[PDB]
Symmetry: C4
């Protein structure tokens, strides 16, 4: 049920939800120098200068990437159910994924990801990241946590991400469902929970003890769950609803639970739109898969692509456009806002007069589908700038 | 008339109708394991585990396909006014339809479908399906029913579908119009009636004795009636209006008349959206014409294409992507949700917390045109996943 | 001003107008056999079985086409300011226009159309059409009428069309403006006036003595006025507003002034949508330029293309798909509703239960942008049916 | 905050903003001869017959273009932070920009635009334009004005444009922010200020002493700021809001500050739409870069493309379609409304009955996305007229 009830037909209503591509940000009463724009966020006791997290996807984050992201002031999450924990040396496996043709990568991944997880590799990945001075953030599905959460705790990871395509505090197992309250209470580190798109679920995740909530179902560049299942709420609406839960939970308890907008982001402008709708940080995959150091070798695939029965992701060719440093902090060599993402955030905040991220969440927004079309006929035809 | 009156101009109003591509499904309060999702539906006394019916189209269903579908838990309808009853061996005819060029198939079909129906073949198709252990479901137009309904009864078909592009209980013949009340009373088997898109007509079809109602005018992949006639209501709105008639008819009489969303479905997500708007089952053609066993040999054409005066269908090349087994129950080798349709339904129901089809009809819906665009720039450009 | 005031910005409002491609027709309470559908309309004392008028465009109507259309039960208008009155032999000129390349036709037409009008040819075209048994309908611009209206009267044309891109009863000349009241009173034949898109103007044209009003600014397939000037109201809204003026004028005076929806029509479905919004007949150009007998030799150009200072039309390649008989009354060999237009109207009226054109004007309409997209992915990709 | 609050999600609202491509103009009560349409505007004491200003962009305006535009009754602005002030002979530089490939121009421009500004060239450009009989209009960014405003005054420029992507009267420097009140008071010539898109900012710019306000953030054909930053309000809404500020400032003080719609204009129709929403004149770049005399050699690039850290523009290929005379006053050789822009304005005003620009600002507007799609299937497919 909802307080908004557009009529689909007799006895069936809906509410309008707006996508990243439908909104735009409006200047306020003042501008400010981009150098003054404060972009920090915080999860648990970990402060970060860059409000960006690399998705737990095998084309995006390996141990080296996690360290490079940590040194730049950002974060990267290693997926503990991917190739990194199933193979001692993932590089030959990543080589095969990148070289196979378009009609074959699904069947290949279904085979390669069938190799059983080695619990010892969970520990090693955590420890080799930390030994190199990086923040060790790792992800598990709810089922994975029931099996490997204690391994993560004993290894001493800095952050645990429990991430399912759609998560709730209430799950009807066929089997004991994962008790998220117990998990957050028992794990020695902060626990991030996702994904959701509704006020109701995000609030319950916060009440369960979440250190942050991941918002987004299916917006990702390599994700097909929306086509396979028909499930999803566009990001601006999802982010705003979950930010409202954050603010109500803060009022109730005094505890601040950051909201992370997860997926569907290509440009710095996409990031800024997500912050304006309430996000404290963003989780992105495809923009970082384009880094020279990315394990995907120019490819980027969803972690549900290898499902043996029902793939819900695909493998796309994103290419390689620069170093992870250039992508995050520049200098930008490109015209499309996919490099120097931090500089884009600070520049946008400057034009809008937002001194820090909380002020950025307060900027006025317009519904403006023409933002991406007005005057862009040449760019679209010639695949330049906003038309690439 | 309608209770909603958007203004087109002075003295002309309209109501907004929403298409499959305009909506999305929102998670509820709980998730559940897909293995617990009950996907059954029932028409007459026939229960089916898969809520899918193959359209009565010559590229989709022949006798073998009808048996294969029944064995898997679904249904297939043989069109008794197509080539199956006009030719003892349809295979050479299907060969010609598939081999001729784009500028020639209309004229060819106008000729081939002029071969008179052989009443003995009506009996033969029904009985050869049943002798092989399949459920024999057959379709006729209203005019066809006035001539051949008794032949279908004498042959002992399990289900009769009366299907016109647009049907009503009230028809002004130039001829005696088909009395649908008498037909349903006199036929010894359940009679499905369609097609319609309004509460008013669907309710009258139920009062006439329909075992089910087919909803949809022109959404089909090989249909051109919307361009030829300008008639149609997008599916979510039509389904909801007709589901409302079902619920009112149930309150009035205690009899449940399932609503079948007919046409325009490509992916598992499209199916789930139709159920969420009130459908008890779906009738699909093009997704099954892509089966290796489909008689269309990779082509799919509307059964109004052969009209000698005004074709209202076309012949499209849908290709061959897998076996009918793979398409309906998997395992899925593809990234786009066109295989393992049953698995997609159960997985979607799982993410939404819908234990059975009735609960699925209650899931919250958003108007979200961005569901199909957010983040999908690569998929569209490379024709992968949702961009194919 | 208007009673609908959507906000563009502070102090600037607007009203929503809907295009042909945004609406669809909804079945009513009954269906009827297409053979019973009465499609007649009437202008002056001239009854026509086919409610279609061929546009006064040099690629569409010459003397032969005007006769062929009259014989089939329709009408064709000869433009008295085009090639037909500037050259004794238009065929070599039409050959050149159709034979020159895309980058050259503007300059060529600017040259060719500078040849002065020969008033004697006005008489000749009218008289040769009538001598062949055809209805002689001719068009002039308002300025043209001030110079040649008496020639048309002396020649004895059956119908006079006064047509400007945008006409009003009130025009500020630099020159004596055309007195439309006097024109209609003095002309011995019915005078059709256009074009307009508003209730206010159409009502004044009616009060001035119009036998019919032409509705439409810029929807045409070979028209660019909307891009050059930014002026226009989409057809459904324009038709409905002008139909309301017709109904009010009828109440005031008892005189019925038919509303003609002019331009932007490709298929029979487009015609039916225009009738449903209030049109008594349609004026179409591009569908008839596709006739084997069309003077355009497969090309179709706007009559403002030859402007020596500011072209407001272009030349498109529409091809040649059949005889004018096939296009209007079939039998249709095509799958896209561009042939057997009369059969399409009658079939559509049948599905909607409309016994005559007045009933067709009462059919329910939905705002349904998805009408043209639902399920049409294959047709669009393969350029078949609705995707051509 | 705003008086319109569409809901994005709980606790986040927005207002609908409409783009140029979403609106259309409606005829009024009368038409008038285009020769009677008064298109004049005025800034300071400078009256101009053509309400068009060439953008301060290096592909659009050099000294020759500025003179040619002035002679025709328009204006051209020289960007004093581009190559015209960094190189004594810009031609070899313009040659290089036009010769490099798509993947190379960003890096090249970052290098070429790093050449320091030569203050003596500021004087030279201004005075050589005036010596040739042209009106010398020049642009600076706010930071540039703090350094070179006195140089412009000493040189005796006719108009000074202070232009930033987003400007406000309130700017938080890291440094003394530019005092716009002092600037306008101390400069001996009129000072135009921009850019903005809100009533609040434009009103303050007027109160600071602006001779005109530039409206627009990111609509330009060679701009990517909307993608890089996510900031922008579509032009019709921005123009109307800022025109409302003009009218209130006029009521307050009796001083008229013209509103200039800046960017995103391709055709005469786009111009007319902007005037109808309140603009007193338009600033355009890409349509004038297509002139034979344009310094871009057929290319057109944003002046933020050369940013060494975060480019916010791109280089597009606009080609060369005619002389600047043909583009502005015709005769038009093209079918798409990109030539004879003045004739298009007067013709549009004629169809609408607008005797002067103030009446044009009062024309009725419809929200009509179908203006650019209705009937245009051929034009789009064949890239003719409105489909190029
Ligand atoms: O439906 C899905 N199937 C998948 O296979 C999949 N893999 C990743 N994700 C989610 O997408 C996010 C990455 O989005 P981008 O690539 O656009 O950053 C990630 O951060 C996840 O939230 C998936 N969603
Ligand atoms: O207007 C029409 N003209 C035709 O020739 C035609 N043939 C099939 N159908 C209908 O389309 C449904 C199949 O749609 P899909 O191929 O999208 O499943 C089918 O189940 C039918 O409802 C037609 N509709
Ligand atoms: O703006 C315009 N510039 C032109 O050059 C032009 N030529 C024809 N017309 C109008 O278009 C109608 C024909 O439209 P179709 O080809 O789509 O039928 C015709 O019936 C006219 O109303 C023009 N409109
Ligand atoms: O965001 C931006 N980055 C740039 O690099 C840039 N360069 C020009 N402009 C603005 O665009 C206007 C020209 O627009 P058109 O080429 O569409 O006329 C100009 O008049 C400016 O207002 C820019 N905006």
């Amino acid at each position: 049920g909802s307080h908004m009830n557009i009529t689909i037909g007799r006895g069936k209503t809906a509410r309008r939800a707006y996508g990243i591509d439908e909104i735009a940000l409006v200047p306020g009463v003042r501008t400010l120098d981009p150098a003054l724009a404060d972009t920090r966020w915080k999860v648990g006791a970990i402060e970060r200068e860059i409000p960006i997290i690399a998705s737990a996807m095998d084309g995006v984050v390996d141990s080296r990437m996690a360290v490079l992201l940590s040194e730049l002031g950002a974060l990267g999450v290693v997926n503990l159910e991917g190739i990194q924990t199933r193979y001692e040396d993932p590089n030959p496996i990543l080589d095969r994924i990148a070289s196979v043709g378009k009609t074959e990568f699904v069947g290949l991944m279904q085979e390669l990801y069938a190799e059983p997880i080695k619990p010892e590799l969970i520990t090693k990945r955590i420890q080799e990241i930390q030994a190199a001075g990086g923040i060790a953030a790792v992800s598990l599905t709810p089922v994975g946590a029931s099996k490997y959460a204690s391994t993560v705790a004993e290894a001493g990871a800095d952050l645990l991400f429990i991430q399912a395509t759609v998560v709730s505090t209430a799950h009807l197992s066929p089997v004991e469902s994962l008790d998220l309250v117990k998990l957050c209470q028992e794990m020695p580190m902060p626990v991030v929970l996702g994904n959701c798109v509704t006020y109701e679920v995000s609030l319950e995740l916060m009440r369960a003890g979440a250190a942050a909530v991941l918002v987004g179902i299916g917006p990702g560049a390599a994700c097909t769950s929306r086509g396979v299942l028909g499930v999803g709420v566009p990001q601006p609406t999802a982010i705003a609803d979950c930010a409202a839960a954050r603010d109500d939970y803060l009022q109730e308890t005094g505890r601040y639970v950051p909201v992370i907008a997860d997926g569907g982001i290509i440009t710095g402008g996409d990031i800024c739109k997500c912050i304006a709708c309430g996000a404290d940080a963003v989780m992105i995959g495809s923009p970082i898969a384009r880094a020279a150091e990315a394990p995907g070798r120019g490819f980027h695939w969803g972690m549900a692509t290898p499902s043996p029965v029902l793939p819900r992701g695909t493998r796309i060719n994103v290419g390689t456009t620069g170093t992870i440093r250039e992508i995050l902090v520049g200098p930008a060599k490109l015209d499309d806002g996919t490099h120097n993402l931090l500089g884009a955030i600070k520049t946008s905040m400057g034009t809008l007069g937002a001194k820090d991220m909380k002020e950025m969440q307060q900027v006025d927004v317009v519904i403006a589908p023409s933002l991406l079309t007005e005057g862009k006929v040449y760019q679209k035809a010639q695949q330049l700038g906003m038309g690439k």
